[PDB]
Amino acid sequence: DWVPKRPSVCTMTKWQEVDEMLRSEYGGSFRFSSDAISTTFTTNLTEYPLSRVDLGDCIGKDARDAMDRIFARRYNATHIKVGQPQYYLANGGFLIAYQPLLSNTVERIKTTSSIEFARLQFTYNHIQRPVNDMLGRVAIAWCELQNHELTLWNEARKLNPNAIASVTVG
């Protein structure tokens, strides 16, 4: 049976449907981190032109179909769609179709055969981000504490300047 080519063949296949894909910008590059699959993708902040993908008509259809189903299933009662879908070419050869959300409150892409490089990025970021947040609070608390002790040393010196001066002077 004969059928048209463009709507029958694709050069990209839908891999994963992420419900929560947080996008952040730091170091001059967007970082799409998914907490569900524990993966982090890096891009160049420039929307990869979908027209550049050879035989990629199935990608506007597949991406929009998943977005509509996911939005109505979970984000209809709490979030709102902002703009149209955005396609970004991530490091390693992964094309990410992104749909920003807000709270009510010609060539062929070569995909790498291992996503473990991205999983390590998420794991390191998931351990570095909090540990640094807790290293930052401890440092802040220590400084606030030291400034608090000065109120006691200013009075302890009068009681016995010999002992206070000895430990402070060295």
Epitope: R64, F71, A72, N76, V82, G83, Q84, Q86
Partner: antibody, heavy 123, light 107 residues
Framework: VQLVETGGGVVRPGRSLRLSCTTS????????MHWVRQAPGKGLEWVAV????????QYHDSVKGRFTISRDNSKNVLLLQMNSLRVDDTAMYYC?????????????????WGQGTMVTVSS | VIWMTQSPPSLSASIGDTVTITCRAS??????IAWYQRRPGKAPELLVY???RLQSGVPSRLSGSGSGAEYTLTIKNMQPEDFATYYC?????????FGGGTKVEIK
């Protein structure tokens, strides 16, 4: 907020015309701009869009390849260079800013509209 | 191109009554749709976004609803300043298309 458009007038078919839209009251560099037309006694129709920084441009199938949208963030002025005009292009052109909901996304909706100017194609 | 069918093209209402304007698209657009208002002699002004988000400063008595390819805009208490042309525009896929428009007038 205030939006003003300049460059309208009567032009012969197949000729070029360039419109300009001045802005004030909002961060021009932080919001995308859109162009809308209103034919006499007809409905509204979108023309084109220019991102906040102008990196991406999108046009309507009825004006793709004929029009040319551009912006100058330094002078906070929007422009739409028109070429190869046709009789069907006779309409009131309005310049409108997108709805700011997120920092760099394009809402593809209109929140502020200008006074509009006429562009009549006659011979 | 996603055609936008808006009806009724024209209807009349009295001050202090309920009205409902229906807008239909040629294909399912989830919730990507906006509503506008254009008073005589003035430029249009946005009212609702994504079929449910009311714009800042818009009266709370005016609200929209619907899903898929069916959408509606309702006003529970008409005021003299509400009589104007209302347009429904979609942004699910390019090119952006507006509705036929419905002119609410005094009856």
């Amino acid at each position: 907020v205030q939006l003003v458009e300049t460059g309208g007038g009567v032009v012969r078919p197949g000729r070029s015309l360039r419109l300009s839209c001045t802005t004030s009251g909002f961060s021009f560099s932080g919001s995308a701009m859109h162009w809308v037309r209103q034919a006499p006694g007809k409905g509204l129709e979108w023309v084109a869009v220019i991102s906040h920084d102008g990196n991406i441009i999108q046009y309507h199938d009825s004006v793709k390849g004929r029009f040319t949208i551009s912006r100058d963030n330094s002078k906070n002025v929007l422009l739409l260079q028109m070429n190869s005009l046709r009789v069907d292009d006779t309409a009131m052109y309005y310049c409108a800013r997108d709805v700011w909901l997120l920092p760099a996304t394009i809402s593809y909706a209109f929140d502020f509209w200008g006074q509009g100017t006429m562009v009549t194609v006659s011979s | 191109v996603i055609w936008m069918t808006q009806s009724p093209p024209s209807l009349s209402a009295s001050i202090g009554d309920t009205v409902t304007i229906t807008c239909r698209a040629s294909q399912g657009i989830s919730n990507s749709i906006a509503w506008y208002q254009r008073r005589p002699g003035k430029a249009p002004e946005l009212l609702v976004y994504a079929a449910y988000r009311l714009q800042s400063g818009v009266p709370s008595r005016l609200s929209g609803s619907g899903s898929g390819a069916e959408y509606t805009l309702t006003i529970k208490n008409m005021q003299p300043e509400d009589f104007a042309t209302y347009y429904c525009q979609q942004y699910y896929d390019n090119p952006l298309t507006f509705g036929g428009g419905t002119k609410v007038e005094i009856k």
